[PDB]
C-alpha cells in the first residue's frame, strides 16, 4: 500500500506504482533563508511557480557494458525553462531540489542501479598517464550542461575515492527485479547563504551501474534512463543584465 | 482577506549517549507475520534488526565508553605540516600557508567537507643534523594583500602592525594560538568551481578547485642581524586542530596523492582497495 | 513645497526638483485580481520585483518642426528584462503601469508638449489618398517596438479624431517655463480579466509638442525627450515554451 | 514568523444629483494671499472656481433637472441600421450582422470605449415604392457555427432550434428582444491588435482591427412559398438599446467614414474641426 | 555646502529586507589599533 506514490508541485505531476520510499536528504526540508543567517540587504525575488516544477532531461541508453554517468547542479538547468532566465539575469541564487530517476524492464531482466547524490564533487585528471603531469579536467569535462558525461575510470569515480563506500552520501538502489525508480529530496548545503549559478555546482548526480545488465537474445535490448528533476524553494537577488557564462 | 490565496519537520533531534547501548534478553519465538530478519536495502536505510531479534541472548550491562570517538579527541594532535629550510640562500624565506603538503594530516581532514576550527601553531627549529647553534630568529604572519619583505633588511621587518615572535634557538620552542578566520563560515576542502567569472580556456583551466576562502596570505622568517650567518636553519611546523565542527562526510581516498591543489591520481597503477587472494572460497 | 518629487519602486529611484502634481487615471489604484473576477484556474505567478521597477526606453531630439510621437503598451517592453522573459513564456498577464516622461530646458525657451494616455487607439490609413482604397497599416507601423514611430497627420491623431479634444483622456502638460516632467499613474483597463500581451495592445502614449519649440540663436538646440516607464502589479498566468510573435 | 518580509484607496463616490446646484450670495473682498482666479492647467485638473469667486452673485434657486442628459435617456431611440433588398434573386438573403452601416448611430456608440446593453429589434417591409402586397415572410437568425440555408427551400427552415418569427406584409411591425450575448463582459467598438497567433504578413493585414467578441453570426430572411415570388421586397431594420452601461469615454471622430470595418478616412480633404473666419478680431 | 554628510540609508532608496547582523566593531577602538609593538630604534656599538 506503499508501493505506489504520486509526486506534483507547479503544473507537474509524477506517478509511479513499483516504488520504494522517500529519501530526504539528511532528514532536513528545504526552506527559504531566514532572517538570522542572510547577508544580502536587497529584496529578493520568488518566482514559486514557474520554477518549482518537474524539468525532464534527456535520455541515456543502458548497453551491457556501460560504466556511469553523472550530472553537475545546477549547470543541467541554467538554460532551460524561466529557471534558464532567473539564472542568467541575477548574481546570486539559493534553491533546493528533488531527484527522480526511472528506468523500467519486464520481469527477464536483471540488474542493479546505484544512484547516489555527493556534495562538493571535484573531479581529477590521471595526471597524464605516468603521474608527472598538472593535467586539468576542460571546461566541456566539468560541465556538462543537460546532456551529462560518461564516467572513465569508474572503480576510482575519477577523482581518487573509491566507489565501494559511496552510500555514505544519501543514496538509492534500483534493483530490476522489485522497482523501477528512485527518489531523493536534497536540501541546500553551502558554507554561504547564497552563490552564483555559473561559477559554483553544488553536487552532482552520479548513476552507476554495479550488477551488469542481462538478458536471454530475443527480449527488448533496448533499456532507456531518464532523469527528472525539480527545484524546490527557489529564491534570487542582485539583478543585472543577462551573462550566460 | 480579498485574495484568499496570498494568506496561505525535523526527522530526529540529538540525545546524549555516555555508555554503549546495553542488552537485554530474550527467548525463542514462533509466529507467522512479523519477521525482523527480512529487509530491503533498496530505501537506502540501513537494517535496525538487533541480537536479540535473531538468536536469543542474554542479559549484559557493558560500560564502554564513547569518548575517544568524538571528533574533538579525534583531530587534536598536533601534526606536520611544513618543513623549510634556509641553506633562500639569502637568510630569509617566503612560504605561502597551504597545509596540505604532508598526507597524514591531508587524509584526516579529507574525510570531512566542511570544517570550522582553531588552531595552535608550533615551531620547532634545528641545524640540518639536529645541532644546537645560538642563534636570533624572527617569524612574521603577512596576511593577504599586505606588503612582503623582499630583502633581509627590509622595511616590511618593522613589524609596526603584523604579529610577530623574536626566539632563539636554545629556547623552547615557540606556541601560538590561531583564531577562526575566514570569510565563509566554515573552511572547504572542495569547491567545485571556477572563483572567477568570464570565459574559461585552456590558458585559465588552473583555475579550477581553488577557493579564494582558505588561501590566508604567507609566511616569513628571518635571521635578525643585517649580515650573512653562517649556519643552516631548519623549521618544522606543527599544528593543532581546536573546537572543532564537521559537516558532510565524504569517502576517504584510496589512491597516493600526487600534488597539493587537485586531487590527481596516477592513472596508470590504479591502487586496488583490497589485498587480493587466490580463490574465492578458501580464505 | 510639493514641487519636488520622489518615486521609487523596485531598485530605481526618481527624483524631480520642478514637477507638477501626479495623475492618477480615473482615480483608481492598481492592483491584483480578486477572486470574484478571475476565471483562470491555475495559480498564477507574481515576480513581484524583478518587473515592478523603473525601464528607461530610448530617447527622442525634438526640433523645431516636429509632429509627434507614440508608444504602444506593452509592446515597448516586450523584448527587454524579465518582464520581456515572462511575457513570452506564458499566455495571460495583467499589470498596470506608471509613465514618467522627462524634458528640459533653460530659461530661455518656450515651449509646450501634451502628454495623454489613450486606451484602444486604434491607427488607420488614408486609404489611398483619394478615399477609394482599403489600405491597412503594415506590422511595422501598429506595433514599432520600444523605438516608436513617428505621426504624419497630427491634427487628426491619424485615426480620425481631432486633437482638439484630447484632453478628456488623463493628461498633463509639459511647459517649458514652469516644470520639465509629467507623470500618469494607469490602471488595468480590458474587458477580460486577463489577454495576451503579444497579440493585444491596451493603450497609445502621445506626446505632441502643441506649441512650436523657440529659442534664440546661440543657445542649445539639441533638446532631448526620454521616457520612462514601470510596471506595477504584473501577474501571469499559462505556461507554455518561448513564443515571440 | 521567521521571515518578517512575509507578513506585509478609492478618490471620490458617487452622489445623486436630481437638480442643478444652486447658486448662493457673496460680498465683495479685498485680501493677499488667497487667489481662486489663478489655477494651473499644467495638473491636468480642470479649475474649480465658481461665479461667486470672481464677481458678486445674488441668491437663485433652479430647479433644473439633469434627467435628459442621463446615458438611459441618450441612447434608447431606435435608429435605422440596415437596408435588405430582394429583388438575392432567388428569394432569400444571408446578412452578416453588422451594426455599422450607417453614419448617424455610428458616431453615437463610438462616444464610448466600452458597452453593454440589451437590445430591442424591429423590421418594417415593404415594396421599394411603399406599395403593400399581401405576402407570408420568415425570419430566421443564425448563430455562429449552425449550417446556413443555400437555397429557399432548404433543410435549415425548419427551424428546429432557431429562433423565428412569421409575419405577413399587412400585419403590424414585429418586435423581438435580444439579450447581452458577448463572450467577453462587454462589447468593445475599438481593438488594437490582431486576434490570431503566427506571423503578420501583408497577406493577413485585414486581421487588424477584428475582435470575434463583436461577430454575431448572420440573418436570413425568405418569401415562405416554394416557388418564385413575383414581387421585390425591403427591409428596414431598427434597434432600441436599453439597459446602458458604458465606460471610458473617447474623443467624437470628425471626419466622414469610409468603410464599416476600418477608421480610415480620406487623406486628401482634410475637413478641419471648426468653419473658418476671415480676421482675429473681427468675428 | 552645509558642510554635514547625508543621512540617507538603504531603505529610502531601494525596498530592502530584514536582516539582523551581529557583526561586532571590536577592531577598530583606538586601544586595538595602537596596542602593537613596533621598531623605533637602532643602536649599534661598532
Ligand atoms: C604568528 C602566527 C603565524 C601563523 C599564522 C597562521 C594563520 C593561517 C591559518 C590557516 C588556517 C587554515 C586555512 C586553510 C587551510 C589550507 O591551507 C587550505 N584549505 C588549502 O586548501
Ligand atoms: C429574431 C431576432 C434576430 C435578431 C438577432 C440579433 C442578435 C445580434 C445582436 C448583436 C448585438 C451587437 C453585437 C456587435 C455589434 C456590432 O455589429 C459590432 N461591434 C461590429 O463592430
Redesign the pocket.
Known amino acids: 500500500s506503499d508501493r505506489v506514490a504520486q509526486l506534483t508541485i507547479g503544473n507537474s505531476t509524477i506517478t509511479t506504482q513499483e516504488a520504494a520510499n522517500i529519501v530526504i536528504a539528511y532528514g532536513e526540508w528545504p526552506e527559504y533563508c531566514p532572517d538570522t543567517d542572510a547577508t544580502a540587504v536587497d529584496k529578493p525575488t520568488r518566482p514559486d511557480v514557474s520554477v518549482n516544477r518537474f524539468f525532464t532531461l534527456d535520455t541515456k541508453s543502458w548497453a551491457k557494458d556501460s560504466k556511469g554517468w553523472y550530472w553537475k547542479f545546477p549547470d543541467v538547468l541554467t538554460e532551460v525553462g524561466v529557471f534558464g532566465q532567473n539564472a542568467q539575469f541575477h548574481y546570486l541564487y539559493r534553491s533546493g531540489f528533488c531527484v527522480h530517476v526511472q528506468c523500467n524492464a519486464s520481469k527477464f531482466h536483471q540488474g542493479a542501479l546505484l544512484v547516489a547524490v555527493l556534495p562538493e564533487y571535484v573531479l581529477g585528471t590521471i595526471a597524464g598517464g605516468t603521474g608527472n603531469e598538472n593535467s586539468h579536467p576542460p571546461y566541456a569535462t566539468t560541465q556538462p550542461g543537460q546532456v551529462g558525461a560518461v564516467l572513465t575510470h569508474p572503480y576510482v569515480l575519477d577523482a581518487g575515492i573509491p566507489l565501494s563506500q559511496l552510500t555514505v552520501c544519501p543514496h538509492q538502489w534500483i534493483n530490476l527485479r522489485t522497482n523501477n525508480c528512485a527518489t531523493i529530496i536534497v536540501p541546500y548545503m553551502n558554507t554561504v547563504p547564497f552563490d552564483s549559478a555559473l561559477n559554483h555546482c553544488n553536487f552532482g548526480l552520479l548513476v552507476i551501474p554495479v550488477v551488469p545488465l542481462d538478458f536471454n537474445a530475443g527480449a527488448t535490448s533496448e533499456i532507456p534512463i531518464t532523469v527528472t528533476i525539480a527545484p524546490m524553494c527557489a529564491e534570487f537577488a542582485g539583478l543585472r543584465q543577462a551573462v550566460k557564462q | 482577506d480579498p485574495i484568499a490565496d496570498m494568506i496561505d519537520r525535523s526527522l530526529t533531534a540529538l540525545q546524549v549517549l555516555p555508555t554503549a547501548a546495553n542488552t537485554e534478553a530474550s527467548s525463542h519465538r514462533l509466529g507467522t507475520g512479523v519477521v525482523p530478519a527480512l529487509q530491503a536495502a533498496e530505501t537506502g536505510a540501513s537494517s535496525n534488526a538487533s541480537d536479540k531479534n535473531l538468536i536469543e541472548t542474554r542479559c549484559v550491562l557493558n560500560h564502554h565508553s564513547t569518548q575517544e570517538t568524538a571528533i574533538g579527541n579525534f583531530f587534536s594532535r598536533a601534526g606536520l605540516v611544513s618543513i623549510i629550510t634556509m641553506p633562500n640562500t639569502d637568510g630569509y624565506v617566503n612560504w605561502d600557508?597551504?597545509?596540505?603538503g604532508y598526507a597524514q594530516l591531508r587524509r584526516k581532514c579529507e574525510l570531512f567537507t566542511y570544517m570550522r576550527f582553531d588552531?595552535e601553531?608550533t615551531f620547532v627549529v634545528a641545524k640540518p643534523n639536529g645541532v644546537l647553534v645560538p642563534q636570533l630568529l624572527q617569524?612574521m604572519?603577512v596576511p593577504p594583500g599586505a606588503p612582503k619583505p623582499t630583502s633581509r633588511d627590509s622595511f616590511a621587518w618593522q613589524t609596526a602592525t603584523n604579529?610577530?615572535?623574536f626566539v632563539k634557538m636554545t629556547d623552547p620552542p615557540a606556541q601560538?594560538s590561531?583564531p577562526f578566520?575566514?570569510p565563509a563560515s566554515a573552511?572547504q576542502?572542495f569547491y567545485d568551481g571556477y572563483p572567477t567569472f568570464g570565459e574559461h580556456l585552456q590558458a585559465n583551466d588552473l583555475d579550477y578547485g581553488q577557493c579564494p576562502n582558505?588561501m590566508?596570505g604567507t609566511?616569513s622568517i628571518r635571521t635578525v642581524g643585517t649580515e650573512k650567518s653562517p649556519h643552516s636553519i631548519t623549521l618544522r611546523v606543527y599544528m593543532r586542530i581546536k573546537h572543532v565542527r564537521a559537516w558532510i562526510p565524504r569517502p576517504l581516498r584510496n589512491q597516493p596523492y600526487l600534488f597539493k591543489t587537485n586531487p590527481n591520481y596516477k592513472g596508470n597503477d590504479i591502487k586496488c582497495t583490497s589485498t587480493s587472494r587466490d580463490k574465492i572460497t578458501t580464505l
Open positions: 600557508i597551504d597545509l596540505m588552531a601553531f617569524y604572519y604579529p610577530s615572535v601560538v590561531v578566520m575566514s573552511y576542502w582558505n590566508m609566511f
